[PDB]
Write an enzyme that holds these catalytic residues in place. Structure first.
Site, mmCIF file in Angstrom:
data_model
loop_
_atom_site.group_PDB
_atom_site.id
_atom_site.type_symbol
_atom_site.label_atom_id
_atom_site.label_comp_id
_atom_site.label_asym_id
_atom_site.label_seq_id
_atom_site.Cartn_x
_atom_site.Cartn_y
_atom_site.Cartn_z
ATOM 1 N N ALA D 14 0.839 -1.190 0.000
ATOM 2 C CA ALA D 14 0.000 0.000 0.000
ATOM 3 C C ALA D 14 0.882 1.251 0.000
ATOM 4 O O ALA D 14 0.420 2.341 -0.323
ATOM 5 C CB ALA D 14 -0.936 -0.001 1.216
ATOM 6 N N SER D 17 5.980 1.801 4.007
ATOM 7 C CA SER D 17 7.413 2.055 4.159
ATOM 8 C C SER D 17 7.882 3.349 3.509
ATOM 9 O O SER D 17 8.665 4.093 4.102
ATOM 10 C CB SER D 17 8.224 0.889 3.595
ATOM 11 O OG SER D 17 7.753 -0.337 4.121
ATOM 12 N N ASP D 37 7.585 -5.767 9.733
ATOM 13 C CA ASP D 37 8.721 -6.251 8.964
ATOM 14 C C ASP D 37 10.021 -6.269 9.772
ATOM 15 O O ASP D 37 10.767 -7.243 9.718
ATOM 16 C CB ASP D 37 8.898 -5.413 7.694
ATOM 17 C CG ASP D 37 7.895 -5.784 6.613
ATOM 18 O OD1 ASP D 37 6.801 -6.274 6.955
ATOM 19 O OD2 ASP D 37 8.192 -5.574 5.417
#
Ligand SMILES: Nc1ncnc2c1ncn2[C@@H]1O[C@H](COP(=O)(O)OP(=O)(O)OP(O)(O)=S)[C@@H](O)[C@H]1O
Ligand SMILES: Nc1ncnc2c1ncn2[C@@H]1O[C@H](COP(=O)(O)OP(=O)(O)OP(O)(O)=S)[C@@H](O)[C@H]1O
Ligand SMILES: Nc1ncnc2c1ncn2[C@@H]1O[C@H](COP(=O)(O)OP(=O)(O)OP(O)(O)=S)[C@@H](O)[C@H]1O
Ligand SMILES: Nc1ncnc2c1ncn2[C@@H]1O[C@H](COP(=O)(O)OP(=O)(O)OP(O)(O)=S)[C@@H](O)[C@H]1O
Ligand SMILES: O=C(N[C@H](CO)[C@H](O)c1ccc([N+](=O)[O-])cc1)C(Cl)Cl
Ligand SMILES: O=C(N[C@H](CO)[C@H](O)c1ccc([N+](=O)[O-])cc1)C(Cl)Cl
Ligand SMILES: O=C(N[C@H](CO)[C@H](O)c1ccc([N+](=O)[O-])cc1)C(Cl)Cl
Ligand SMILES: O=C(N[C@H](CO)[C@H](O)c1ccc([N+](=O)[O-])cc1)C(Cl)Cl
Ligand SMILES: O=C(N[C@H](CO)[C@H](O)c1ccc([N+](=O)[O-])cc1)C(Cl)Cl
Ligand SMILES: O=C(N[C@H](CO)[C@H](O)c1ccc([N+](=O)[O-])cc1)C(Cl)Cl
Ligand SMILES: O=C(N[C@H](CO)[C@H](O)c1ccc([N+](=O)[O-])cc1)C(Cl)Cl
Ligand SMILES: O=C(N[C@H](CO)[C@H](O)c1ccc([N+](=O)[O-])cc1)C(Cl)Cl
Ligand SMILES: [Mg+2]
Ligand SMILES: [Mg+2]
Ligand SMILES: [Mg+2]
Ligand SMILES: [Mg+2]
EC number: 2.7.1.-
Lengths: 178, 178, 178, 178
Positions: D14, D17, D37
């Protein structure tokens, strides 16, 4: 006389990459490095799930189909062509097919002056290094540690079991004719 | 009694990360790993060019300003809090300030049960490994190989100069009280 | 008729790599991908600090010396040789020298059938993407967004400013003759 | 008043990050970034093949067992503790359990001042981005694009379908109370 290509062969986690970076640092002239790893990186991601591509078993096994081989072949010719064009090339490979793999390379290399290097390492030690690096399917190191060298002829053999990468690099560089 | 935190200290390229991955594989219970490297990764990229941030000299030197320290401190308290919350934590650090660095950690750890591990490696050998991995500013290994341990007290000391990561991991795991 | 090579050109952060991975996924036959990035990866690390190597200014500038060019040239011939050998090749490059860069490629390609692709993106948008990816010297995107295309001739032009990578890939794939 | 934590939620690909790196660049004070993550990165590799760990289906599905949850919980408390200690924390997560996931976080956050951010993106577009980045199991983007937001309450909602990361970052930063 002048060495045009340096071809290293050894099982996973034997220490090839480390040696390669050491060689590039040690050797005075610029040496380009390519290997089975950079090749897979350049290949489409889907090659890793294709019938005749490359398959990584959950236990460390590696299977190579004709689709993968055809491509590797064209890539091998190009690498050699780079050498004939004047680029010094280091190749990092894993001769899963032992002597057959070396023959295939001889097939593409022709009369080009090559330095055949064998990179050995005890299976158990390589396995430990495999665990230590966190980036490798458990089981490859042990499976490739020995079979990969069967019937293969080298100009220089180094063993990383008790030798540092930089040290193996010094041993290899001494056999490189400028 | 039960070991809550394992704190490793050693210069760059001494082999800490490899040991850490081996420990996570060896130890039966899940151990979370964090270090100065994951911390820098979590910090804003600009921290690496800030006055009081962290600066990497072109020759391997490392400078840490107050901006970086303030953040590290809050991060240290959180890591300890994770431990008190029941998470087994492995920490991979580089005590640039020797004993002073260990004191700082003792400051945050309190009465938490910690296993202090020293990871040594000859400067020249570490330097070679630094060259071999291709990902590290030349000069750090040599600069940190010894100074980092001055006046630091350990529960276990391993030396990677002639020991594999998995082996050092076995030595360390034996001192971990379940 | 049959397209042998696809050569993309565009400034840093314009979205080339994303397009390349999309092309490899979309195109039915396996396409090998190489670029200025994989080349630098294959070159000795020291090439990045050498007089006639490649230098990355602290502000995003990029300088290429004769040492780097000589090697690139041999590498270019090899890539083309791979194509003539039957491997489908995608190349991801940055024509810092504009038209001169394209001429150099034409020089190596010869009469090989190539699909010249231009990948554009607004400088400001690319700059933002540069910040977003965390892995790139701030300043490159803006510096290369336009100069890189001056006097360069393409068969297909895509603009990532308002088009997704997969979409640009569809536009490019339609011009690929099987 | 002062924002202590910024918690982003959104499906894979999406654009979280990218936004996070943009936020760290934009916001004047240093913000530490952690996410699902970095957590998986810190967890033992074997957690990814454990019964009650985390399992990645070959089709993009994700399963989380109690082993993984227990650890995540302790990690969540530590992150919050970092905030209470004065560190500004950005969290990048994927609320697979929708509202239930947000409740869990509220559970650890307590009365800490948090900025809840929703990061949306059309499933098909995210899927394309998934293909473009080459590093993600095909199928996750589509599977998580919508379910992840069901019953979740945000302070700010951004949509990357037609907005650049840096732009979404500006929208989010404006809601951050210094
Ligand atoms: N001589 C050595 N002694 C100890 N560790 C080594 C040595 N050489 C390499 N290593 C480390 O062992 C790991 C595995 O070695 P690599 O160089 O990555 O092996 P490899 O030949 O590249 O594989 O590709 O096939 S997979 C790396 O993380 C190295 O840093
Ligand atoms: N005992 C060892 N013998 C030989 N090579 C090793 C050994 N332990 C680690 N290595 C390799 O040496 C390199 C450097 O070791 P690392 O584990 O990365 O050091 P480090 O402590 O992480 O640093 O972070 O500080 S920088 C890696 O590429 C390892 O694979
Ligand atoms: N069309 C697009 N719209 C939005 N973001 C994109 C698009 N294409 C790529 N990106 C992202 O922008 C970043 C930069 O794009 P890259 O594909 O890495 O550019 P590049 O052409 O590779 O450079 O190499 O020169 S540097 C990556 O993190 C991509 O995921
Ligand atoms: N707004 C955007 N428009 C176009 N491409 C984008 C945008 N934001 C991010 N990207 C790119 O899309 C890819 C996926 O976005 P990421 O930021 O990596 O998503 P993510 O939220 O991190 O996942 O972790 O969950 S997996 C990256 O390669 C980015 O460069
Ligand atoms: O596209 C695919 N397969 C066919 C056969 O179904 C094909 O001939 C092929 C296999 C691998 C490959 N690659 O690596 O790009 C390309 C095509 C599968 Cl990978 Cl989905
Ligand atoms: O892990 C990988 N490759 C290792 C070698 O680095 C695997 O052992 C392997 C061995 C031989 C091979 N080949 O030559 O066909 C390909 C992969 C890639 Cl996924 Cl990076
Ligand atoms: O934003 C910056 N600096 C100021 C002082 O000019 C600041 O106080 C600071 C330094 C590092 C940092 N970080 O790591 O996010 C944050 C703020 C520079 Cl990095 Cl451009
Ligand atoms: O190379 C790096 N860090 C090494 C340690 O891995 C550097 O030697 C270093 C040492 C100490 C340190 N600290 O604790 O302040 C930070 C970085 C980071 Cl850029 Cl990944
Ligand atoms: O070895 C070096 N330089 C000389 C000249 O001093 C040389 O001709 C050269 C430059 C770059 C290079 N490379 O990329 O491997 C190789 C050799 C420096 Cl990189 Cl230390
Ligand atoms: O950041 C890098 N390269 C970018 C392009 O990806 C840089 O903008 C660049 C541009 C042109 C170039 N060349 O063709 O000579 C080399 C690097 C490498 Cl260090 Cl990964
Ligand atoms: O060690 C393992 N499993 C047991 C149960 O057989 C265990 O309780 C466990 C699962 C995941 C894990 N982790 O992430 O470190 C740790 C322990 C398997 Cl991963 Cl081999
Ligand atoms: O690909 C990965 N993770 C993605 C998210 O980045 C996967 O979609 C995922 C989603 C939710 C999750 N969780 O919160 O339990 C874990 C992984 C990791 Cl292997 Cl890097
Ligand atoms: Mg290798
Ligand atoms: Mg480390
Ligand atoms: Mg690129
Ligand atoms: Mg993310």
């Amino acid at each position: 006389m002048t060495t045009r290509m340096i071809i290293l062969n050894g099982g996973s986690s034997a220490g090839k990459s480390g040696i390669v970076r050491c060689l590039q640092s040690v050797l005075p002239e610029p040496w380009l490095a390519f290997g089975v790893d950079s090749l897979i990186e350049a290949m489409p991601l889907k090659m890793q799930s294709a019938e005749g591509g490359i398959e990584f078993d959950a236990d460390g096994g590696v299977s190579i189909g004709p689709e993968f081989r055809a491509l590797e072949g064209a890539w091998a010719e190009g690498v050699v062509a780079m050498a004939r064009a004047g680029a010094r090339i280091i190749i990092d490979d894993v001769f899963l097919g032992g002597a057959a793999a070396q023959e295939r390379w001889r097939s593409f290399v022709g009369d080009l002056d090559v330095l055949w290097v064998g990179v050995r390492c005890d299976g158990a030690v390589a396995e430990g290094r495999e665990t230590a690096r966190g980036d490798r399917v458990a089981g490859m190191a042990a499976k490739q540690a020995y079979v990969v060298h069967e019937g293969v002829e080298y100009d220089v053999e180094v063993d990383t079991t008790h030798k540092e990468s930089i040290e193996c690099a010094w041993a290899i560089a001494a056999h490189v004719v400028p």
